Structure 1
Amino acid sequence: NRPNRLIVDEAINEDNSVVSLSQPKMDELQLFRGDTVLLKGKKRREAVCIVLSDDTCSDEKIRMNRVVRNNLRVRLGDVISIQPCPDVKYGKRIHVLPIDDTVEGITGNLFEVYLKPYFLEAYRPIRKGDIFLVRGGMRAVEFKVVETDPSPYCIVAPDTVIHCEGEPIKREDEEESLNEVGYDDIGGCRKQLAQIKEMVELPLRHPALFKAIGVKPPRGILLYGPPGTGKTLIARAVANETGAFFFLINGPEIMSKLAGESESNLRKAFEEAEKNAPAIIFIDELDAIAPKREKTHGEVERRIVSQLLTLMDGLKQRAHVIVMAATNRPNSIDPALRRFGRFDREVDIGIPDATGRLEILQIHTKNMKLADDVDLEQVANETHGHVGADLAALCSEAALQAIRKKMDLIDLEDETIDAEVMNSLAVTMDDFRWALSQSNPSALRETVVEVPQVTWEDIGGLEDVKRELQELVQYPVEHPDKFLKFGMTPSKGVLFYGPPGCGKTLLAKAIANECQANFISIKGPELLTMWFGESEANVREIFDKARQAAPCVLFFDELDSIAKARGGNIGDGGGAADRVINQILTEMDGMSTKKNVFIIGATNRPDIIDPAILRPGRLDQLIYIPLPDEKSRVAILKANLRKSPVAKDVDLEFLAKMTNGFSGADLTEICQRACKLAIRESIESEIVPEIRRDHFEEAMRFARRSVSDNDIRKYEMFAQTLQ
């Protein structure tokens, strides 16, 4: 269909002016990784960029960063024309020059720093007019090239004399400035980022179609998550990047006004925004306006929760407006806000995980120029519990520490503090570890939901259980119509039972990982909390959170916990049923047909579990998890030692021999007991620094087995008795 045009799409690399083509296009465009290519754009303008070769991209989507797009005036999902330019011709000092307000308090010589490092080792091709952006010294300043000695475009060479100027030509009115947040400023919430963009792509990008079609596009979207997880960030990025007019209501501003000065700004906020359409109204802190409940007193509060309901109703789909509202927990707001036609969509931004806390950290230091040893992987490992704002606060406190150890050491403080001096400034690992030492996990801790990092590589033995579990969890999600051929419902429960420390937890996490599914762990103390606190209404919030995190594995560990707290060898006079397990029964059997929520219980006392859990439509598959065998006891010892260094001198299958049986936990005990005797040696020294066989022999002096061969027979009994 005249394959010249191509779509624009996001790109992974940090560098500017690099487009990443789909590899089965090579000889079509005929141009390799050494050829720069001209790209057509809106208001009659272009750019030229060197090309990279990668597998994962789609065929039709060019991958390029924000700066190369803004000048093109392409917004993601737009199409550009890609035509080669082998005809490239080098320049002699293209003239480059500072812009915006960015251009903040800088002074002196910014060219040996904000240019010369960047142009070097590069040959970065530059067409006159590009905004190409540089970063250093806790700031991103971009230099627009106003003049190119040859034209239109030029490679840069190390041999072009370089022109010191530094004058502040103000940015033109019509371009929308770069400092503003795009999608690449959002680190760690991306699964849901596709979700919001999917909802809003067609309404915001294509106003014509919904006037040319019968259908209803989403009227309002409810972003919810703990505070500081980037909900405002998301709304702004989506608005800024689709180009739609972003209006911002925040609850306390509306609540700041007097009665009737309030709802006027409110009903003006939409009657102002529906002009500028397509537009996004972001109502963050929707709890401030709209907790319509028992708890509000007064008419004027109840008035404002009203009229918000009827501005939601008032948009007739001739409004191109999308309404986003940020909330913290969903029960927070008035339930009539969720009527269909007000806030129909509900999207949970959630706490970022270790794998996500990395990207956030890497977004909030892109201007710093760090120090070489800090790896941001273990920085991202001990920041657990931090939302993305906690993370932004960490690295800014890191950078204010390092500015405390240096610089004003001399007291160089002048009118405008020097450029080259902050670029020298670097922040080492001893700053960040000092940044964490502060209170910063002052944000929320509630039930986590993320894909665990335990692959099957971590579980010694249990081969048959590993394949049994895959069938249970995998085959239904992958191959449904096969289940439909025999008219079968996949069983959605499992109950692991066996002695303690045999890996019932590991297996559950391992299988969530193999599915790349979310894993919610409800541990024993949390069920006991509901049972003492007589609050089993919490079990509903647990399953609805699995439903929103689906596909997920929901794991009840120590499901016998409440049965124990009642005794159970003699125990109370009652039956097996109790408050909390009752609500687990209720919420299980009353759950949605298949949302890919798979329920795993685990127990070390299958004896005293109530049998109602067992009935079909519940945890329906009992899987015994035995004490390991020396076959497995070898892989248990290795999967523990696959991190810490273990010299060849100490040998395994002989340790795994001497134990008639231990738990996989008793073996980790031995391992960790040995590794303690080692570090004891290494800290002391020197006044050698690795593990040794005799470390493990002193460890084995304390090896105890927690399972007494009595109850294995008891466990052996529950096995054959049940079938």
Structure 2
Amino acid sequence: PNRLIVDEAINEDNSVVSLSQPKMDELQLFRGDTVLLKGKKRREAVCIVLSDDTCSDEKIRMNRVVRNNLRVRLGDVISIQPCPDVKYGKRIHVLPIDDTVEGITGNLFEVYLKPYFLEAYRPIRKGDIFLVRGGMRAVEFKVVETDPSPYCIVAPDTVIHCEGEPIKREDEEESLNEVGYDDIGGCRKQLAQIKEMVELPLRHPALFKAIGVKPPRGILLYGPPGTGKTLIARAVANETGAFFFLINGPEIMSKLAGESESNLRKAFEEAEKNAPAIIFIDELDAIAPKREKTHGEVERRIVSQLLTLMDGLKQRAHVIVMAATNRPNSIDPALRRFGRFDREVDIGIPDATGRLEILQIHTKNMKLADDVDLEQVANETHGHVGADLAALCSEAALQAIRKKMDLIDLEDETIDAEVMNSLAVTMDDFRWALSQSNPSALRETVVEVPQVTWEDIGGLEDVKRELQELVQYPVEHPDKFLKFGMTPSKGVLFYGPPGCGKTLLAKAIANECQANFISIKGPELLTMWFGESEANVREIFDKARQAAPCVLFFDELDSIAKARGGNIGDGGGAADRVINQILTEMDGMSTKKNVFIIGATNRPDIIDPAILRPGRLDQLIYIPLPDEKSRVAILKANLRKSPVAKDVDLEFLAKMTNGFSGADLTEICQRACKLAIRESIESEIVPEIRRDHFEEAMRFARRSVSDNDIRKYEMFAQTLQ
């Protein structure tokens, strides 16, 4: 009774857990009440219960601080009971742990403990370990003496002592600065998939022994360097408790014949002795490259040695082998056959939300000024991975240290806690770091759920509805499609003038569907054409299959024709290497994988007609320049982010901008805003954009689509009926 499954929490606070209301009613506790949690090895913790809309009924959400004190791990089950008789304490004694008090001195109580407890009203228990962050350090403390027992709430009027040497960490507890799941920012969906594959075989092996099902024995993670492939593998081992063995290709490959095989085989034998265990092999493509791509005896044999060691995992109880590579196709295909490494996860590049999450994780210890805006940084850090975002946090800290701290402290290993806590990092320090850092994964395609919604698109009311019918209905109402024998379309192509919202349309439908958006641009199709590397098309479509549900957007479909001369070219046809592989993958893609393909072009007259046949991009939507009411809607939408003066006549502007595209109306709105900002700045050397700013902006803005192009687009659309 009163048993709940331990899982991760959204609320990071050291005294807060979250329950779903049905359990709060059965336990007869209310929001804000204090409860006791009973874990393992006669260990207990005291906390406050809140509620949210994310915790499931059978789970209790708690952070690492609570799980460590209870000596429990994710996937375990604990008992919960209310304790309404909790009162305030009188005197407590709290001391830091030596594991974190290194390179630091001074009055750690005034810097850490007193801000932590003062007006905090936190419930504590004797022996509780908790982490206090600040001054770019994370210091954990233990409660060693209390007058009340076994728990109390620490009020601002209580006496807190902190005298004595730092306490050595006990073997029954883990350091709170160790790598866990809360250290992983982006790619959280991928971590969830891995947890489902790994947590249960290791946490509850009795269920897999008793039930006729087979556990995964090998998971391949792939993506650019610096995305967290090695961070995930270690975090999983730390959270589950499995022994972590580290292997890397270059080291094993550097060894001579007989040495590389012995070292690789030994690591597997050690994992069995230390089972449950996880073996992580980094740079899998280096330790086991494709045999058909090498010539040496050592390279051919070491691949065979790994292949047989992986098969041996049927006898090595509770051993899971993880591996990391840059590309799933850079390793010997035998590794990916049934068994061995039969599971793979696409880590890729963190999305806009994940990048912010990573910046927030690597600033937990940093004291930030009020002007610091990590969301703005995350939006500008395109192409950056966790390794680069962590670099930004360290570099911004170094700028604060060289300005202030290096004028205070000596050339030594010890700094006073007060000096560290007095140091804050400003927006100028993050801006400097941003200009110095260079993304390590800017060339690879980034896949993410877009933030564009339907409210961001002016006009095109019928096109927005059309995409909902093409993408949402086939999966929201599948019984109607079966009833009438409907065959969903696999994709749609947009054509017409540039700058009318084609990109927003593809993103907006992906947004509402909560589907991943894969953006492929002309330069990618041009590179494949000129480099005779059309095989990369298959990887693009394969990502769409693994990222499903997703929308796969192929922009600038005309770029293939341009590569061969475009308007003139040679005497051949429209078919070529790149488009042929694209058509092949399209025909081999089923609507059952919830992948919808969208194309776009500004030159539909030179698109290989094959792509428009039934089964491909059979649907054609014309996106003309916005009409009178749409241009007003576009101007109004772009101004949602700033106050607009009552003298601004949006209809007058739309009447003048008869030949303008949506992209050009945006420049007018943005220019008028910048002009209003310029005046605002000057007034301090204004609260809204005035009519004068729009009229001035009209003097610089021009239409991007000429009258000759408009007639060409309209005549083409008319020809198609």
Superposed pair shares fold, TM > 0.5: yes
Q: CA deviation at 1:159?
A: 2.0
The answer to which of 346-355 and 671-680 deviates more is 671-680
* 3-state SS of 1:396 partner: helix
Q: CA deviation at 1:408?
A: 2.7
CA contact (8 A) 2:225 2:440 kept: no
**Cα distance change on mapping 1:698 and 1:178 into 2, 3 Å:** closer
Q: How does 1:291-306 map to 2 (within 5 A)?
A: 291-306=289-304
The answer to which of 284-293 and 334-343 deviates more is 284-293
Q: CA deviation at 1:273?
A: 0.5
CA contact (8 A) 1:495 1:619 kept: yes
**Cα distance change on mapping 1:126 and 1:569 into 2, 3 Å:** closer
Q: CA deviation at 1:23?
A: 2.3
CA contact (8 A) 2:119 2:155 kept: no
* 3-state SS of 1:315 partner: helix
CA contact (8 A) 1:226 1:444 kept: no
More helix by share: 2
Per-residue CA distance 1:367-422 (angstroms, 9 max, x = gap): 12222210211122222221101111111111112111112313445563211210
Aligned to 2:635: 637
Q: CA deviation at 1:452?
A: 1.6
* 3-state SS of 1:358 partner: helix
Q: CA deviation at 1:514?
A: 1.3
Q: CA deviation at 1:598?
A: 0.8
The answer to which of 652-661 and 125-134 deviates more is 652-661
* 3-state SS of 2:448 partner: coil
Q: CA deviation at 1:683?
A: 6.4
**Cα distance change on mapping 1:8 and 1:411 into 2, 3 Å:** closer
Aligned to 2:80: 82
Gaps of 5+ in 1: none
Q: CA deviation at 1:679?
A: 5.6
Q: CA deviation at 1:296?
A: 2.8
CA contact (8 A) 1:182 1:238 kept: yes
The answer to which of 396-405 and 678-687 deviates more is 678-687
CA contact (8 A) 2:5 2:77 kept: yes
**Cα distance change on mapping 1:100 and 1:264 into 2, 3 Å:** farther
Q: For residues 455 and 396 of structure 2, what CA distance do their matches in structure 1 show?
A: 36
CA contact (8 A) 2:520 2:553 kept: yes
Alignment TM-score, normalising by the size of structure 2: 0.95
CA contact (8 A) 1:521 1:557 kept: yes
* 3-state SS of 2:379 partner: coil
Per-residue CA distance 1:143-196 (angstroms, 9 max, x = gap): 111222121111112222221314122111232332221111111110111100
Q: CA deviation at 1:291?
A: 1.0
Q: CA deviation at 1:86?
A: 0.8
CA contact (8 A) 2:186 2:357 kept: yes
CA contact (8 A) 2:648 2:690 kept: yes
CA RMSD of aligned residues (A): 2.2
Per-residue CA distance 1:201-254 (angstroms, 9 max, x = gap): 221112112222222211100011111111111111111111112111122232
Per-residue CA distance 1:548-581 (angstroms, 9 max, x = gap): 2221111122212333555666654333323322
* 3-state SS of 1:400 partner: helix
CA contact (8 A) 1:110 1:166 kept: no
Q: For residues 469 and 268 of structure 1, what CA distance do their matches in structure 2 show?
A: 56
CA contact (8 A) 1:277 1:320 kept: yes
Q: CA deviation at 1:65?
A: 0.4
Q: For residues 712 and 296 of structure 2, what CA distance do their matches in structure 1 show?
A: 64
Q: CA deviation at 1:485?
A: 2.7
Is residue 716 of structure 1 aligned with residue 714 of structure 2?
Answer: yes
**Cα distance change on mapping 1:703 and 1:90 into 2, 3 Å:** closer
**Cα distance change on mapping 1:667 and 1:417 into 2, 3 Å:** closer
Q: For residues 183 and 509 of structure 1, what CA distance do their matches in structure 2 show?
A: 30
Q: CA deviation at 1:462?
A: 0.7
2:177 corresponds to which of 176, 179, 202: 179
CA contact (8 A) 1:248 1:281 kept: yes
Q: CA deviation at 1:608?
A: 2.7
Q: CA deviation at 1:600?
A: 0.6
The answer to which of 603-612 and 680-689 deviates more is 680-689
CA contact (8 A) 1:224 1:328 kept: yes
CA contact (8 A) 1:629 1:661 kept: no
Q: For residues 335 and 619 of structure 1, what CA distance do their matches in structure 2 show?
A: 33
Q: For residues 703 and 424 of structure 1, what CA distance do their matches in structure 2 show?
A: 49
**Cα distance change on mapping 1:539 and 1:34 into 2, 3 Å:** closer
**Cα distance change on mapping 1:698 and 1:420 into 2, 3 Å:** closer
CA contact (8 A) 1:203 1:210 kept: yes
1:564 corresponds to which of 562, 565, 569: 562
The answer to which of 708-717 and 336-345 deviates more is 708-717
Q: CA deviation at 1:10?
A: 1.1
**Cα distance change on mapping 1:682 and 1:533 into 2, 3 Å:** farther
The answer to which of 670-679 and 575-584 deviates more is 670-679
CA contact (8 A) 2:289 2:299 kept: no
The answer to which of 139-148 and 254-263 deviates more is 254-263
Q: CA deviation at 1:690?
A: 5.7
Q: For residues 443 and 683 of structure 2, what CA distance do their matches in structure 1 show?
A: 40
Q: For residues 105 and 661 of structure 1, what CA distance do their matches in structure 2 show?
A: 66
The answer to which of 415-424 and 384-393 deviates more is 415-424
Q: For residues 365 and 707 of structure 1, what CA distance do their matches in structure 2 show?
A: 46
**Cα distance change on mapping 1:565 and 1:242 into 2, 3 Å:** closer
* 3-state SS of 1:24 partner: helix
CA contact (8 A) 1:128 1:153 kept: yes
**Cα distance change on mapping 1:48 and 1:282 into 2, 3 Å:** same
**Cα distance change on mapping 1:39 and 1:376 into 2, 3 Å:** same
* 3-state SS of 2:600 partner: strand
**Cα distance change on mapping 1:103 and 1:570 into 2, 3 Å:** closer
* 3-state SS of 1:324 partner: strand
Q: For residues 413 and 93 of structure 1, what CA distance do their matches in structure 2 show?
A: 39
Q: For residues 225 and 568 of structure 1, what CA distance do their matches in structure 2 show?
A: 34
**Cα distance change on mapping 1:318 and 1:690 into 2, 3 Å:** same
Is residue 312 of structure 1 aligned with residue 310 of structure 2?
Answer: yes
Alignment TM-score, normalising by the size of structure 1: 0.95
**Cα distance change on mapping 1:651 and 1:107 into 2, 3 Å:** same
**Cα distance change on mapping 1:716 and 1:701 into 2, 3 Å:** same
Q: CA deviation at 1:469?
A: 0.5
Q: How does 1:42-57 map to 2 (within 5 A)?
A: 42-57=40-55
Q: For residues 311 and 702 of structure 1, what CA distance do their matches in structure 2 show?
A: 68
CA contact (8 A) 1:221 1:323 kept: yes
Q: For residues 688 and 123 of structure 1, what CA distance do their matches in structure 2 show?
A: 45
Gaps of 5+ in 2: none
* 3-state SS of 1:162 partner: strand
**Cα distance change on mapping 1:90 and 1:297 into 2, 3 Å:** same
CA contact (8 A) 2:382 2:442 kept: no
The answer to which of 702-711 and 62-71 deviates more is 702-711
Q: For residues 584 and 462 of structure 1, what CA distance do their matches in structure 2 show?
A: 29
Q: For residues 707 and 565 of structure 1, what CA distance do their matches in structure 2 show?
A: 23
Per-residue CA distance 1:61-83 (angstroms, 9 max, x = gap): 11110010111112122111111
Q: CA deviation at 1:655?
A: 0.9
The answer to which of 470-479 and 659-668 deviates more is 659-668
**Cα distance change on mapping 1:115 and 1:706 into 2, 3 Å:** closer
The answer to which of 523-532 and 379-388 deviates more is 523-532
Q: CA deviation at 1:89?
A: 3.3
**Cα distance change on mapping 1:452 and 1:525 into 2, 3 Å:** same
Q: CA deviation at 1:58?
A: 0.8
Per-residue CA distance 1:613-632 (angstroms, 9 max, x = gap): 11111001111212211111
Aligned to 2:511: 513
Q: For residues 600 and 16 of structure 1, what CA distance do their matches in structure 2 show?
A: 47
CA contact (8 A) 2:489 2:615 kept: yes
* 3-state SS of 1:628 partner: coil
* 3-state SS of 1:294 partner: helix
The answer to which of 341-350 and 242-251 deviates more is 242-251
Q: For residues 190 and 67 of structure 1, what CA distance do their matches in structure 2 show?
A: 21
CA contact (8 A) 2:36 2:81 kept: yes
CA contact (8 A) 1:394 1:440 kept: no
CA contact (8 A) 2:625 2:661 kept: yes
2:373 corresponds to which of 354, 375, 384: 375
CA contact (8 A) 1:21 1:51 kept: yes
Q: CA deviation at 1:688?
A: 4.6
